[PDB]
Design a protein around this ligand. Structure first.
Ligand code: CA
Ligand code: CA
Ligand code: CA
Ligand code: CA
Ligand code: CA
Ligand code: CA
Ligand code: CA
Ligand code: CA
Ligand code: CA
Ligand code: CA
Ligand code: CA
Ligand code: CA
Ligand code: CA
Ligand code: CA
Ligand code: CO
Ligand code: CO
Ligand code: CO
Ligand code: CO
Ligand code: CO
Ligand code: CO
Ligand code: CO
Ligand code: CO
Ligand code: CO
Ligand code: CO
Ligand code: CO
Ligand code: CO
Ligand code: CO
Ligand code: CO
Ligand code: CO
Ligand code: CO
Ligand code: CO
Ligand code: CO
Ligand code: CO
Ligand code: CO
Lengths: 172, 172, 172, 172, 172, 172
C-alpha cells in the first residue's frame, strides 16, 4: 500500500481512473468538432475556436484527476481514448447539441462518483468533486443550452446565415 | 422538461423559489430598518448605512438563487414580498436584535434546504448552499450577536449616549 | 408632529408612501423580466442585463422617495410588494411592451403626485418631482418606445433572428 | 445558551476543542523538530526552516478552529499541550517519517470530525472541515511522502551527503 | 560534550529550558485571553487583537531562547505547556490584571536567571538576558500597569461603556 | 472533391491521418510518464514537468497536422488513441530510453511521409514536413540521447542519488 493512502477505497480509485478516461474522451470529441469547423466547406472559425478551447479545458480536467489519484496514493491506469462517434458533425447547431449531450453524460458520471465517495465516507473526494467539477459542469451545460436555444431561434441549421451570424456575434 | 435539467428534484426547485422570497423579504426588512434610523427623531446615520448595506446584500443573495434556479433548469415563480413586521424599530439595540432573529430564521431555512438537497442526492445544490450561504449566515449571526452584546453592555437602549457612541465608533 | 415638518400636507405624505410602493413594484417587475431572459430556453443575456439595470434604478427611485419622506418629517409606511402580473414574459418585444406600459403607469402616478403637491401649495415637493422624476420618466418612455419600434420593424417576436440581433446590436 | 448558537451539537463543540489541542500539539512537535536540526551536531538549517514553517502553520490551524468555536457559539476549553514523544529526532529522514505519521493522525481526527458533523446534520461544520482542512492534509501528506521517498532513494539516513544535498536542493 | 560548549554551566542550561517552558506558557495564556474577547458575549475585538499579538511575541521569546540553547551547545528539553489557570477571564480589566501578574512572574524568573548567570560567571548569558529580555519585561509591565490604571479610572469592569471606549481609543 | 484540393494524393491524405494518430499517441505516452514521476513513491517533479511539457508539444504537433489536412482539402479521420505500452516506467533513465525509442519511431514515420510526398511530387507537403517536423525530431532525439548518456554516466537507475541530482540540475 502507498505510504500516503488514507481513507481511499479501491472502488473510488477505480472510478477516478474511469473518470480520467472520460475527461480525455471529451477532450478528443471537442478536438474533432473543432477541426470539423476548420474545413473549407464548413468554415466557421469561431465555432472551431470555441471547441478547441473546450478540448484544452477537458485535458486540464483529466490532468487534475490524475494529480488527485497520486495525491491520494492510488495508481493511474490509462485506457485507450476512443475516437468520437462522428467524423462529420453536420452543423454548428448539431455540434452544440452533441456537446450538450456529452457534458450531461460527463455530469452523470461525476454525480455517480460523488455518490460513491459519500457512500464510502470519503469527504475529501466528495468535496474535491463538488469544488472542482460539479459547478463547472452545471455552467457548461447551461452555456450549451443557451447556445442551442439561440441557434434554433435564429433558424439553424437550415439558415446558413443564422450560424454565420452566431459565430460572429456570440462566439467571436 | 428543460434541456439543461439534470438530477434536480421538483422539491428542490420549489424550495429554491421559497428561499428566493425569503432573501427578498430580508432585503425589505433591512430597507425598513435603514430608513427608520434616517428619521429626524432617531438620527443614527451609521445604523442607517449599516442596514442599507445589509439590504443590498440580501438582494444579491436573492439574485444568485434566481441565477441558480435557471442554471439548473428550474423555473422561477416569484411571490409577494411581505412588508416587515414593524414600521418603527424602537432603538438601535432593538433593531440589531430583530436582525439577529431574522438571520437565524434565514439560516434555519438554508439548513433545511441543504438537508433536502442531500436527501435528494443533489451534491451540486448542497455544495452551492455550503459554499455561498452557510458561512455567510454564520458570520452574519456572529456579527449581530457581537453588536447586541456591545449595545447591551454600553447601556442601550436606555442610554441615548450608548447608541450614539456605538454608531460612531463601531458602525462608522 | 415632527420638529422638521413644514408645509407638508397629510395627503402628500400618504401619496409619497404609495409612490414608494409603486417604485418598489416596478423594481420587482424588472427583476422578473431580467431572469426570464436568463432562462436556458430564452437566452437573451443583454435583454437580461437591460432589465436588471432597470430593476436597480427603480430601487434607487424608491430609496430617494424614502429619503424625501424623512426629509419632510413624514413617516414611511411600507406595504407588500406585489408579485408581477406575469411569470413568463413571452418574448423580448412583449417584455419591452410590458415595460412601456409600466413606465406610463408610473408616470401617471407621478403626474397626479405633482398635481396634488401644487394643489396643496407645496413647491418643494412639486419641484422634487419635476427635478428627479418627470424627465427621467419621459426619457424612459421614449427609450422603450424606440426599442418597441425597432423590434416590430425587425420582425419580432416571430423572427427569433430579430430579437437576437437586437440583443446584440442595441442592448449589447 | 449562546445567542448565536444554531444547529451546533454538544458533541461537535467537544470534538472541536479536542481538535484545537491536536493542532497545538502538532505545532509543538514541529517546533521541536525545527530546533533539533539547529543543533551544532545536526546542522541542517533548511530542515530547521522547513519544520519551523510547519509549526507556525499548525498554530494557524488551531487559531482558525478557535475562531470557529466562537463563531458557532461554543466555548473554548484549552488543555495542556503535551510535549512531543521524542527530544532527539535522529535524522532528517526519521523526522520526515515522524511528521508523515503525525499528519496522518491529524487527518484521521479531521475525518472523524467530518463524520460527526454529517451525523449531526451540521453542514456548516462539515463544509468548514472540507474547505479548510481536508485538502490541506492531503497535500501535506503527499509532500511528506515525496520527501521520505527522495531521502530513502538518496541513501539517507546512512549517507550524511544525501541529507545535506536534500537540505540544499529540495528544502532550500 | 558539545564541540561549541564553552563556559556554559549545567545549571544555566537547565534554567534556560525552564524559561523556554515559561515563555511558551505565557504565549498560551495570552492565546486564551485573546479568544475569550472574541466570544459573542464579550465581543471586544481590540482586546482580542492585543492579546493575540502578545501571544505571538511570547512565542518569539521562546524561540530565541531555544536558539540560544543551541548556540551555547546546550540541549533543549521541552516540557508540557500547562493550560492557563482560567477559561473565562471575566472582563478586560481582569485580563489586564492577570497579564500584569503574569509578566511580573516571567520577570522574576528572568531576574533569577540573570543572577544565576552572573554567579556562574557567564557574561554572555547575563548580557543576553539584559539585552533581549529585561527591558522588554519592564516595558511590558509598565504598559500593563498603565492599561489597568486607565480601566480602573474609567469605571471598569462595572461600566461596560468604559471597556468599550478603552477598546476603541486605547487598543484600537 | 474539395474546392481547395490541388496536387494532394489520396495516399498522402491517408498518411497524414496516420501521423495525426501517432502524434496524439506520443502525447499520451508522455502524459503517462509525467504522472508516473508525480507518484509519492517516485517523486521526481522535474522529470514529471519535463514529460508533461513534451505531452503538450506533441498535442501541438497533432493539431498542426490536422490544420494541414484541412488546408490541403483532405478530410480528417481520427482513430482511437492507444494507451501506452507501460503503466509503470520504472525509473527516470528507463523513461528517457522509452522516449528516445518513441521519438525515433515518430521520426521514421515522418521520413516515410516525406518519401511519399516526394514520390507523389507534392513539394508543399514535403517542405511542410521538412520545415516543421524533421529538425524538431532531430533535436528531440539528440536531447534525449544526451539525457540518457548523463543518467547512465551518473550511475542511474541503481543510484537514486543520480536521478535526484539530474532532476535538480538538468531538468530543473
Ligand atoms: Ca475503438
Ligand atoms: Ca462509429
Ligand atoms: Ca401582507
Ligand atoms: Ca403587522
Ligand atoms: Ca398578492
Ligand atoms: Ca396574476
Ligand atoms: Ca422647477
Ligand atoms: Ca505530559
Ligand atoms: Ca516520552
Ligand atoms: Ca463542500
Ligand atoms: Ca495540566
Ligand atoms: Ca485550574
Ligand atoms: Ca487498446
Ligand atoms: Ca500492454
Ligand atoms: Co485506504
Ligand atoms: Co467543458
Ligand atoms: Co470535463
Ligand atoms: Co449523507
Ligand atoms: Co431532473
Ligand atoms: Co445579511
Ligand atoms: Co441572505
Ligand atoms: Co406641516
Ligand atoms: Co425605469
Ligand atoms: Co421609477
Ligand atoms: Co444548537
Ligand atoms: Co502541516
Ligand atoms: Co494542522
Ligand atoms: Co562548558
Ligand atoms: Co509580553
Ligand atoms: Co516573554
Ligand atoms: Co488533388
Ligand atoms: Co517531442
Ligand atoms: Co511529435
Ligand atoms: Co527527387
Amino acid at each position: 500500500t502507498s505510504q500516503v493512502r488514507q481513507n481511499y477505497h479501491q472502488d473510488s480509485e477505480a472510478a477516478i481512473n474511469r473518470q480520467i478516461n472520460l475527461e480525455l474522451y471529451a477532450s478528443y470529441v471537442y478536438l474533432s468538432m473543432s477541426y470539423y469547423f476548420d474545413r473549407d466547406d464548413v468554415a466557421l472559425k469561431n465555432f472551431a475556436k470555441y471547441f478547441l478551447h473546450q478540448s484544452h479545458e477537458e485535458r486540464e480536467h483529466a490532468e487534475k484527476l490524475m494529480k488527485l489519484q497520486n495525491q491520494r496514493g492510488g495508481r493511474i491506469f490509462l485506457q485507450d481514448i476512443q475516437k468520437p462517434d462522428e467524423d462529420d458533425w453536420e452543423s454548428g447547431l448539431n455540434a452544440m447539441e452533441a456537446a450538450l449531450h456529452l457534458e450531461k453524460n460527463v455530469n452523470q458520471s461525476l454525480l455517480e462518483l460523488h455518490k460513491l465517495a459519500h457512500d464510502k465516507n470519503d469527504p475529501h473526494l466528495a468535496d474535491f468533486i463538488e469544488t472542482h467539477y460539479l459547478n463547472e459542469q452545471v455552467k457548461a451545460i447551461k452555456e450549451l443550452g443557451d447556445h442551442v436555444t439561440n441557434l434554433r431561434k435564429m433558424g439553424a441549421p437550415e439558415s446558413g446565415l443564422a450560424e454565420y451570424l452566431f459565430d460572429k456575434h456570440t462566439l467571436g
